[PDB]
Amino acid sequence: VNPTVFFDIAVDGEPLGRVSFELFADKVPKTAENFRALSTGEKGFGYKGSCFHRIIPGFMCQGGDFTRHNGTGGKSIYGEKFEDENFILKHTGPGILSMANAGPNTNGSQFFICTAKTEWLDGKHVVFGKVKEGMNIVEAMERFGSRNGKTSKKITIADCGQL
Numbered sequence: 001v002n003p004t005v006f007f008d009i010a011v012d013g014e015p016l017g018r019v020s021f022e023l024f025a026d027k028v029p030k031t032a033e034n035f036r037a038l039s040t041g042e043k044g045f046g047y048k049g050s051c052f053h054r055i056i057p058g059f060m061c062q063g064g065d066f067t068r069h070n071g072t073g074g075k076s077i078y079g080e081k082f083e084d085e086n087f088i089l090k091h092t093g094p095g096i097l098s099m100a101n102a103g104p105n106t107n108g109s110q111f112f113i114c115t116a117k118t119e120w121l122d123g124k125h126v127v128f129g130k131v132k133e134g135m136n137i138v139e140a141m142e143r144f145g146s147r148n149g150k151t152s153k154k155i156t157i158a159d160c161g162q163l
């Protein structure tokens with residue numbers, strides 16, 4: 001019942017591999033739907049072609065800023081921002097998919113994929129999915145990050161959609 005979406009990842013334009021996610025629409029339907037629709041592009045904008053602008057090995061990969069490409073942009077399917085839906089789910093380990101934000105009730109399109117347990121984010125960022133397949137591809141992406149988050153190669157979502 002929960003939707004599955006994929007990202008095909010490229011590094012400086014060269015294919016790397018595919019990551020798929022489960023979206024916990026059963027627990028966070030509004031937040032899951034935003035990510036799903038941005039992944040299919042069905043509202044006329046979304047993640048295809050955007051990059052992962054911040055990758056910190058041993059912490060997270062952050063993407064979803066499809067308007068400014070650097071962490072200052074993005075928007076939801078519900079407007080610029082939308083509310084924190086709930087905090088049922090927690091940041092329990094690698095593979096968790098969670099919303100980036102800039103304060104209470106400021107979700108847009110930016111998200112991160114945790115590559116470590118990040119329990120200090122519980123109750124502050126909304127968890128809405130997990131990596132299903134291709135965690136090995138996330139681990140490969142992580143190697144292009146650095147302590148300050150700058151990437152040493154351009155990491156893009158070359159294609160994305162729903163499985």
